[PDB]
Design a protein around this ligand. Structure first.
Ligand SMILES: Cc1ncnc2c1ncn2[C@@H]1O[C@H](/C=C/CNC(=O)c2cc(-c3ccc(F)cc3)cc(O)c2O)[C@@H](O)[C@H]1O
Ligand SMILES: [Cl-]
Ligand SMILES: [Cl-]
Ligand SMILES: [Cl-]
Ligand SMILES: [Cl-]
Ligand SMILES: [Mg+2]
Length: 213
């Protein structure tokens, strides 16, 4: 089997069903002790939690679910009735994420869309009845951060106050996105220095709050 299947199996055998905190702990233990994986991790995860708690977003979009770690992290802090949509183009990973969410008992709060973000984002308004997004977590291919930001704005999915939170702005890095949001009068940006998941390597998150056109 694959690393991702091993992680799902480990969660299933080392966490309590319906207990998201135990699911996160199990994944963090697996990835620290057994096999590294590109989950946001606990160091950056704590920053994410602090952000989610500040803004209490009613609708969050996540680009790049992977195994569902960040989806569990975010969805567990959502208020009753609040929703997370997560896009994942790799069907194998989309299946892992759905199963991870089911195990955590968060399946009613999250929808996992199996496709490419550039194909699905234009469908959000008409097919998924989205008006605007309250928050967007960017954690997919790093060269897609800027193009999907620009696509979200073209699609009318951003509103004044929409929070963009971007992983890996240092490693692997997202130089074009970072330069763009920091230079644009349409974003107010904050850098949160942290560490690469499960590693003593500097990384960080960038928060970019959309200010309108
Ligand atoms: C257009 C589109 N649409 C839908 N899903 C999409 C999508 N593009 C990608 N995806 C999905 O998102 C995930 C992939 C995320 C890419 N993340 C990283 O590559 C990543 C890498 C590291 C890393 C750091 C140091 C290293 F030495 C090696 C790797 C750390 C990270 O935290 C990363 O996130 C993966 O699940 C992929 O299918
Ligand atoms: Cl993750
Ligand atoms: Cl990438
Ligand atoms: Cl700024
Ligand atoms: Cl960590
Ligand atoms: Mg990442």
């Amino acid at each position: 089997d694959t690393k991702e299947q091993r992680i799902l199996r480990y969660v299933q055998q080392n966490a309590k069903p319906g207990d998201p905190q135990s699911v996160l702990e199990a994944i963090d233990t697996y990835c620290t002790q057994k096999e590294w994986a590109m989950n946001v991790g606990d160091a950056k995860g704590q920053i994410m939690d602090a952000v989610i708690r500040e803004y209490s977003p009613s609708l969050v979009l996540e680009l790049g679910a992977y195994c569902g770690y960040s989806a569990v992290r975010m969805a567990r802090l959502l208020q009753p009735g609040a929703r997370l949509l997560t896009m994942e183009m790799n069907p194998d990973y989309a299946a892992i994420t759905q199963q991870m969410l089911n195990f955590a008992g968060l399946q009613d709060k999250v929808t996992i869309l199996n496709g490419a973000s550039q194909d699905l984002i234009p469908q959000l308004k008409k097919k998924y009845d989205v008006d605007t997004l309250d928050m967007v977590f960017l954690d997919h291919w790093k060269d897609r951060y800027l193009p999907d930001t620009l696509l979200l704005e073209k699609c009318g999915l951003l509103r004044k106050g929409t929070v963009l939170l971007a992983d890996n702005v240092i490693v692997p890095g997202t130089p074009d996105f970072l330069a763009y949001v920091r230079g644009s009068s349409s974003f107010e940006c904050t850098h949160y220095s942290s560490y690469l998941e499960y590693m003593k390597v500097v990384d960080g998150l960038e928060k970019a709050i959309y200010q309108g056109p």
